[PDB]
């Protein structure tokens, strides 16, 4: 199951659809443990931390099955928090420890890549991305992990830089994808949500939600407190 | 309810002053294909009522609520004896972690865990077996007691046991349960620390089961016709 | 492989030996998190709780290798929330959830049993606890789980009762065994630690509820025995 | 015997007033057969130095010690981007659980996490805890410490999982273990990715070393 044409990157072709969270749908914050300093800025919860963990477990099972028997290289893109990647790796490590333990099944490799914005030399002057050297990914099966997909610009621009070194396959894992006017889709996606700005778990806003372990929409009270 | 430790014995089973459980509306479910389900349970499960991670987040919040109610007090927790998957094991895990990291409360006796059976449990002294109480409840005289139960459907087991416990004169009596079913029955028993309020349906998964069919199913669901038919 | 002659019960034949803890060998209690109320009764620690967890993970793996692909019935000699059986089952459940053959092997069964034949105390909706009738184990592969083996009399007696219903195989898992001065003394098949003959508290073990929140294992002190 | 945040800056690297680390005597090991080890690692692992569970129990105790020292104060924790983030991640995990279940009695802003390469203005007048996987020569923390002192923090302490008894120097304030002068791998340390899925700590064998050097 690990081979996939390079031209299918960003299409989510043949993927298992994410959990769908309908528009303006939430849980009551009073039903969950929330930090006392965040209470004044949170009244509703989008994704409970426990529901995030159940979907990340399922994505790790889906990933382990797609690459079983193959050497896998997982890239952690350094945008915002490292939260989602850490949780995903923890479950993949546990599954690896038992499923397929009896073989010369080489364990997965982890890699950390940084990005920097760059203005190309063309008549539009539009932005793109510059990466760390990626030559080590030649002829490898690569999984790129990103906290959330919003416009899809980061993974589109990054994707072209990685295509240039000729990897064997390229897929995307992300915790959330937004339904927006704002095209690129992931292959292993946790949730599909409405077009709103979220915080909590691996997301933040000026460190105000650094100890909040559930996902919520950024409120006007938080924007105000801060600004 | 919660809050102040002391509470009139007469309020047992009324859920007075409690923090209301998470409300799960009638006929509301999740897609089983979004979660990890054992292959052998798949023919019997199309929809999930409560994902296992949602169950754990609610148990964490109930452990918080309980700790705040009994802050600075000696607490006796009576667990209706269940197996490894019972609700009391997860609740105790969270209460033990909160207790271990509450440094300012080191002078308060840590909680005491007790096991009860609802029929006469016989034993032999000093033979190292588990101490399970049944006929003699005298150790609870003048103590703060919390009874922990997997689910309140009719609650008759808790009403009958509660009348026996009252006769020894405990200082306070409260109930913790993961799930309470909605009923039109008047004056039905209610818990004080309740995880979820659900429609009156029969559930399996997590601490619940039906002829061992869902012994490794880590989410809660309504017992289906195909599973009822398998027997 | 799951097969094993019934007469080999209690011999520990063909086992993987347990981790050996030498005589008078301890860790400093100041290096670990200990409940303040227990601090006056604990100066040395025998087994840190994380060392207990690493050995339980290894035992679970050993058990999974022995019974892979077979129908397994695990007997918990009744204990509460801190019993060794709960921790063992947590790791066995994880290996089972990710075993590699989750559609082609039957998941294990858990049973709750009393040591002696008392009158059943069962009722509808309550935990099934077996006492007087052990007949469900006829022709089954059975694993009996106990917190610790000292003299071995408990498991010898219970063992004779289970042999009367004719199980397919019988093995024993225990966290600790004691190095007592006997010959032909019962021993387990999946054992966490071999320790010197001393009386222990902490984790699944206790002494008059004094170590109910103590998550490491230690020897029982005279200060502790004095109090009570 | 103190658990208080204030501390003179000139005490940085001296380990003054610390709780000594667990002492692991020279030539003391555990049998590797008593633990779960990845099959591909087995031929390179002669014996184990520190079981993963022993590491976790020591990190939990360090986290408890850290929480008491800064209780009620705003704390800024720096993860030095040198080697693996394994030790920092485990330490933060325990500190976060203690914080979530500790004093819901107001104020005390929860701790902050920061990642530094190898600019510092944000640490002026702050309580700072610098986290490093292991201390060998002490050169990394001596150099970085002089740059941090320049911005004028309120206090500066160090947390590290292991310190080595090298040949006759910098010491941390919250230290897991004291070991002999050997090169280690596994759990939160690695060598050419060879021990990436190994959950316990061992000494790097010459067979492993010679595979790359
Ligand atoms: N906190 C937070 N960050 C977001 C959100 N949507 C996008 N981002 C950030 O913006 C980055 C760029 O996403 P893009 O628009 O390129 O797809 C993401 O990697 C993420 O860090 C959001 O809703 N909340
Ligand atoms: N599996 C399952 N057991 C239930 C359900 N409702 C009640 N029970 C069983 O009935 C017992 C006593 O119910 P109670 O008296 O507390 O309403 C519970 O401890 C539980 O084992 C249900 O929906 N599913
Ligand atoms: N707390 C504690 N209980 C023990 C110890 N040794 C034996 N036991 C208890 O004594 C029972 C009988 O052990 P036996 O001598 O029959 O093997 C065990 O099941 C256990 O409950 C010990 O060192 N500490
Ligand atoms: N894997 C491993 N890395 C070490 C060891 N000793 C030192 N290092 C690496 O060397 C870096 C600098 O140590 P220093 O000599 O500056 O104290 C550490 O942060 C760590 O990444 C060791 O025994 N094993």
The residues of B annotated with a catalytic role in the active site are 153
Query: Residue B162 corresponds to which tokens in the numbers above?
Result: 């509660």
- In angstroms, the Cα distances linking C16 to C176, D79, D100 are 14, 42, 42
Residue C105, Cβ density class (10 Å: 0-12 exposed, 13-18 middle, ≥19 buried): middle
D102 and B97: CB-CB below 8 Å?
A: no
Ligand 2 mutation target, pool B151, B154, B195, B199, most atoms within 8 A of CB? B151
Contacts of A223 (CB under 8 A, 6+ apart): none
Per-residue DSSP letter, D131 = E
Whether residue B101 and residue D103 make contact (CB cut-off 8 A), yes or no, is no
Question: What are the tokens at B70?
Answer: 């009994």
In this complex, how many residue pairs, one in chain A and one in chain B, have their CB atoms less than 8 Å apart? 49
Nearest to A35 by CA among C134, B80, D96: D96
| C177 Cα to the center of ligand 3, angstroms | 10
Distances (CA, A) of D202 to C86, D41, D102, D178: 30, 11, 35, 14
Q: What is d(CA D213, CA B145) in angstroms, rounded to the nearest whole number? A: 65
| Residue spans of alpha helices (H) in B77-175 | 87-100, 156-166
CB atoms within 10 A of CB D92: 19
DSSP for C129-147, written as a single string = EESS--GGGTT-EEEEEEE
Is A204 flagged in the annotation as binding? yes
Which CATH architecture does the domain made up of D1-213 adopt? 3-Layer(aba) Sandwich (3.40)
Protein residue whose Cα sits closest to atom 24 of ligand 2: B203
Question: Are the C-beta atoms of residues A193 and A149 closer than 8 Å to each other?
Answer: no
The DSSP-derived string for B30-44 is EEGGGS---GGGGGG
CB distance A155 to A163 below 8 Å: no
Backbone angles phi, psi at C192, to 5 degrees: -70, -60
Contact B155, B189 (CB under 8 A): yes
Report DSSP letters for chain C, one per residue: -----GGGTTT-TTPPPPEE--TT--EEGGGS---GGGGGG-SEESB-HHHHHHHHHHHHHHHHHHHTTS-EEEEEES--TT-HHHHHHHHHHHHHHTSS-TTTSPPPEEEEE-SS-PPP---TTS--EESS--GGGTT-EEEEEEEEESSSHHHHHHHHHHHTT--SEEEEEEEEEEE-S-SS----SEEEEEEES--EEBTTB-STTTTTT--SBEEPPHHHHHH-
What is the rounded distance in angstroms from the CA atom of residue D125 to the CA atom of residue D108?
16
Give the separation between CA A40 and CA D31, rounded to whole angstroms: 53
Contacts of C164 (CB under 8 A, 6+ apart): C134
What are the structure tokens assigned to C161, written together? Answer: 């009762």
Contact call for residues A94 and A64 (beta carbons, < 8 A): no
CA atoms lying within 13 Å on the CB side of residue D131: 26
* C95 touches A: beta carbon within 8 Å: yes
CATH class of the region C1-228: alpha beta
Residue D100: list chain A partners with CB under 8 A: 33, 35, 211, 213
Phi first, then psi, for residue A28 (nearest 5°) are: -80, 125
Q: What is the third-level CATH fold of B1-231?
A: Rossmann fold (3.40.50)
The size of the C-D interface in CB pairs under 8 A is 50
Residue boundaries of the structural domains of chain B: 1-231
Q: What share of chain A is helix, strand, coil (3-state, %, to 5)?
A: 30, 25, 45
Q: C-alpha A93: how far from its chain's center? A: 18
Contact B46, B221 (CB under 8 A): no
Residue with the smallest CA separation from ligand 3 atom 23 is C199
How far apart, in Å, do the first and last CA atoms of chain A sit?
48
What DSSP string describes B180-231? EE----TT--B-SEEEEEE-S--EEBTTB-STTTTTT--SBEEPPHHHHHT-
Query: What distance separates the 2 farthest-apart alpha carbons in chain D?
Result: 56
H or E segment and range at residue D115: strand D112-116
Chain D nearest CA to C30, separation (Å): 9
What is the experimental resolution, given in Å to one decimal place?
A: 1.6
Residue with tokens 């010898």: C156
| Residue B140 near residue B71, CB atoms below 8 Å | no
Asked whether B178 and B195 are in contact (CB, 8 A), the reply is yes
Task: Let me know: does A49 contact A85? Beta carbons within 8 Å.
Answer: no
Cα–Cα distance, D128 to D113 (Å, whole number) = 10
Q: Which structure tokens are listed for D133?
A: 């996987």
**CA-B204 nearest atom, ligand 2:** 1
Residue A155 Cα: closest atom of ligand 1: 16
The fold of the A1-227 domain, in CATH, is Rossmann fold (3.40.50)
Residue A48's Cβ-side half-sphere holds a number of Cα atoms within 13 Å equal to 23
Q: Could C49 and D55 be called an inter-chain contact, meaning their C-beta atoms sit closer than 8 Å?
A: no
Please indicate whether, in this complex, the C-beta atoms of D197 and A86 are within 8 angstroms of each other.
no
The catalytic residue positions of D are: 136
Integer Cα distance of B124 and B131 in angstroms: 10
Q: Which residue is catalytic, options A43, A62, A150, A213?
A: A150
DSSP-assigned beta bridge partners for residue D115: D79
> Does the annotation list A150 as a binding residue?
yes
* Residue D11, annotated as binding a ligand: no
Ligand 3 atom with the smallest distance to the CA of B129 is 21
In order of A52, B71, D73, D211, the CA distances from D206 in angstroms are: 43, 56, 47, 8
Structure tokens, B8: 């009139």
DSSP state of D14: B
Which residues lie below 8 Å from residue D74, measured CB to CB, with a gap of 6+? Answer: D108, D109, D111, D112, D126, D127
DSSP at A106 = P
Residues 6+ apart with CB under 8 A from A184: A10, A149, A152, A155, A156, A159
D148 alpha carbon, distance to own chain's centre: 19
Residue D173 C-alpha to ligand 4 middle, in angstroms? 17
Do C54 and D53 touch, CB atoms closer than 8 A? yes
Euclidean distance between the first and final Cα of chain B, in Å?
Answer: 41
Nearest-Å Rg of the Cα atoms of chain B is 18
């Amino acid at each position: 199951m690990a081979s996939k044409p390079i031209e299918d990157y960003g299409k989510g072709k043949g993927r298992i659809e994410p959990m769908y969270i309908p528009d303006n749908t939430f849980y009551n914050a009073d039903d969950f443990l929330v930090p006392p300093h965040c209470k004044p800025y949170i009244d509703k919860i989008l994704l409970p931390g426990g529901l995030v963990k159940d979907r990340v477990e399922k994505l790790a099972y889906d990933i382990h099955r797609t690459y079983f028997g193959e050497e896998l290289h997982i890239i952690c893109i350094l945008k915002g928090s490292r939260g989602f990647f850490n949780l995903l790796i923890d479950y993949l490590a546990t599954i690896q420890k038992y499923s397929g333990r009896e073989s010369s099944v080489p364990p997965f490799f982890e890699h950390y890549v940084r990005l920097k914005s760059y203005q190309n030399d063309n008549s539009t002057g539009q932005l793109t991305v510059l990466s760390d050297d990626l030559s080590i990914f030649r002829d490898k099966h690569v999984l790129i992990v990103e906290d959330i997909v919003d416009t899809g610009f980061t993974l589109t621009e990054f994707g072209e830089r990685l295509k240039a070194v000729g990897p064997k396959s390229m897929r995307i894992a992300t915790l959330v994808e937004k339904r927006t006017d704002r095209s690129l889709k992931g292959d292993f996606v946790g949730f599909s949500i409405e077009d709103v700005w979220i915080v909590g778990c691996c997301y933040d806003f000026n460190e105000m939600f650094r100890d909040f372990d559930h996902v919520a929409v950024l409120s006007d009270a938080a924007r105000k407190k801060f600004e």
